[PDB]
Design a protein around this nucleic acid. Structure first.
Lengths: 50, 310, 197, 50
RNA sequence: CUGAUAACUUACAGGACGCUUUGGCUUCAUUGCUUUUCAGGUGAACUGCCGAGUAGGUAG
């Protein structure tokens, strides 16, 4: 739980590491977001499947 | 300590900064830019973004949300350090209130720190906040070079106290929220350079763009404009300027970093003394020498905050 | 009946455009004491990047060709050996005939250039009526340009930093006597005069 | 004919089934499971020893 | 300085004729991947002119 090899210098910890990420945002001038799905309830709990 | 599985969620949430050219007929069009390529005789794209001829000024719009994710960790794994960190946050909140960090965060939004370079060689730039939840008029800051220079220039009691509080309550309350919609007006000289955010391209000047009304426009980043608001860290050993809040106080312009683990002022050296900071925040008086200024830094890191795990 | 004195740049590391521009500045200083338009540019080692270490001054007369190459600048870069002037040899019959053309269309693609162009069109729309919208003048989105190796030139009478930007292209080995210009040439308002390289 | 983000069919099933507040003590509802695992707290409540 | 010293296996050729693999079939029940991110043009390639002109040229 101590310090590493002196390769983690004040210079080396300040090198910019790049990540790639998927970015989703609301486009400028949009009114709002509409989120739609469907759900169905049934009686599969009355009787075991096997 | 560092319980192998510990994450926080960010408490400040900025968006992309959309640019508009507003015309002498007070109509606004999305600012568009040129992308030249030198077709070398028998890849190296370069972008140029200026204010088009006979334009009134530029409008820069984005939104920022202050929320309450710093109270409890996202994942913690350990029913020992969870309550330690929750106790440390609420002991901070009660002993030394959210005023300092709230003010420091809010000043960067109200002075156009998030424009980065576009305020250089500019005549007049004004900032209008639309806060939420809010009952009254829009908060206005007129030409921010002459009459908004120091802290006291902002503390003109007209709205300042009404918008600092609501950032304190956001960090105080469970499911606390404050949403600011920020709009800046830039009166630049004729045919002046606009400096938006640049795409990485691992190895000249490709810009980060979006689509507005079916035409591409430069955006000046989302994480870019978050780095600007979080330039509040001037507690590192001696002091020169405010750094962007990291774990190892990284300066980007020169590729050194202060708060190096050797100094014992990085986040992981200060965090591993949480159990200590619990007892000094109970007894009168806490000094604004290194202990308060470390609690500021620890909190600043928790308003940010990814994974503090090993 | 053309001769050539190729001046090569010896010092092993140097900017070639910084020398070529200066050489054409001293050519431009000449042709004003002696109001003549006879002398060309002839960049023999023009590659895609770093125009080569030598430049000649191909012309007919060979009395002005060597009049201007003794003007205490070319001479002063001779004792300190950064230049190597030739001995005014004649051009052979079957040579490669190129053409170094100042375009000036590249200067008016720069954002400043576009602004300057729109401002002029705004001034001489004094065929009066509608003050035409500057709104309806946008840089497209994309320009593919080539090749133009811009030389660091500057004005004398006004302290303005311009940039003559010049293109190489080779055909049609004969026209004029000669024609050229102030900064050497293959364009100025009359000619596409070749140069024997 | 355009790529759109989804929020998932199994994730929405987990949101609806976040009703389990009957576990030994009780603080907030869990995803109904066999051993009622907490995802935030990496521990499992409702563990067979209980 | 060799189980030493020397060493021509050759010539010719017809594998053919015939053939039915088949019938039958249930792979299914359950599911949260998420947390945090600065790409970087110190100013610099300007001002005109000709031109009906977002055309095409032009001096310094």
């Amino acid at each position: 739980s101590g310090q590493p090899i002196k390769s983690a210098t004040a210079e080396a910890l300040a090198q910019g590491n790049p990540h790639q990420v998927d970015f989703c945002h609301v486009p400028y001038g949009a009114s709002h977001i509409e989120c739609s799905f469907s759900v169905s309830f049934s009686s599969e709990l009355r009787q075991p499947y096997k | 300590k560092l319980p192998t599985n510990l994450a926080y969620e960010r408490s400040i949430d900025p968006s992309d900064v959309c640019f508009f050219v507003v015309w002498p007929d007070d109509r606004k069009t999305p600012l568009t830019y040129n992308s030249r390529t030198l077709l070398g005789q028998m890849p190296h794209q370069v972008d140029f973004c200026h204010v088009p001829y006979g334009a009134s000024h530029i409008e820069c719009s984005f939104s920022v949300s202050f929320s309450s994710e710093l109270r409890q960790p996202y994942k913690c794994n350990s029913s020992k350090v969870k309550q330690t960190l929750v106790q440390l946050v609420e002991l901070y909140e009660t002993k030394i209130g959210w005023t300092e960090l709230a003010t420091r965060y809010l000043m960067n939004i109200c002075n156009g720190k998030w424009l980065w370079k576009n305020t250089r060689k500019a005549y007049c730039w004004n900032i209008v906040l639309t806060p939420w939840p809010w009952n009254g008029e829009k908060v206005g800051f007129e030409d921010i070079r002459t009459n908004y220079t120091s802290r006291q220039d902002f503390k003109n009691n007209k709205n300042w106290s009404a918008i600092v509080e609501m950032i304190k309550t956001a960090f105080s309350s469970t499911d606390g929220l404050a949403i600011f919609e920020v709009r800046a007006t830039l009166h630049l000289p004729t045919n002046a350079m606009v400096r938006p955010s640049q795409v990485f391209t691992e190895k000249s000047r490709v810009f980060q763009s979006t689509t507005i009304d079916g035409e591409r426009s430069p955006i000046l980043g989302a994480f870019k404009t978050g780095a600007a608001i979080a330039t509040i860290d001037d507690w590192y050993p001696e002091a020169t300027e405010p750094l962007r809040v990291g774990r190892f106080g990284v300066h980007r312009e020169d590729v050194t970093c202060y708060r190096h683990p050797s100094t014992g002022k990085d986040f992981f050296s200060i965090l591993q003394q949480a159990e200590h900071y619990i007892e000094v925040l109970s007894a009168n008086k806490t000094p604004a020498q290194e202990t308060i200024n470390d609690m500021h830094f620890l909190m600043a890191n928790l308003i940010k905050g990814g994974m503090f795990q090993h | 009946k053309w001769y050539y004195k190729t001046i090569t740049f010896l010092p092993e590391l140097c900017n070639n455009e910084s020398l070529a521009a200066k050489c054409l500045r001293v050519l431009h200083g000449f042709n004003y004491q002696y109001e003549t338009r006879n002398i060309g540019v002839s960049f023999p080692l023009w590659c895609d990047a770093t125009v080569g270490k030598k430049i000649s001054f191909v012309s007919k007369n060979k009395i002005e060709l060597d009049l201007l190459l003794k003007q205490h600048y070319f001479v002063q870069m001779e004792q300190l050996q950064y230049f190597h002037i030739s001995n005014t040899v004649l051009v052979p019959e079957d040579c490669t005939y190129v053409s170094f053309r100042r375009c000036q269309s590249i200067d008016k693609l720069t954002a400043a250039g576009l602004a300057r162009k729109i401002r002029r069109l705004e001034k001489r729309a004094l065929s009066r009526g509608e003050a035409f919208d500057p709104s309806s003048f946008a840089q497209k989105e994309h320009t593919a340009i080539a090749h133009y190796h811009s030389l660091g030139e500057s004005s004398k009478q006004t302290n303005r930093n311009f940039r003559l930007n010049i293109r190489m292209l080779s055909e049609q080995p004969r026209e004029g006597n000669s024609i050229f210009s102030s900064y050497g040439l293959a364009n100025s308002e009359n000619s596409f005069q070749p140069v024997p390289l």
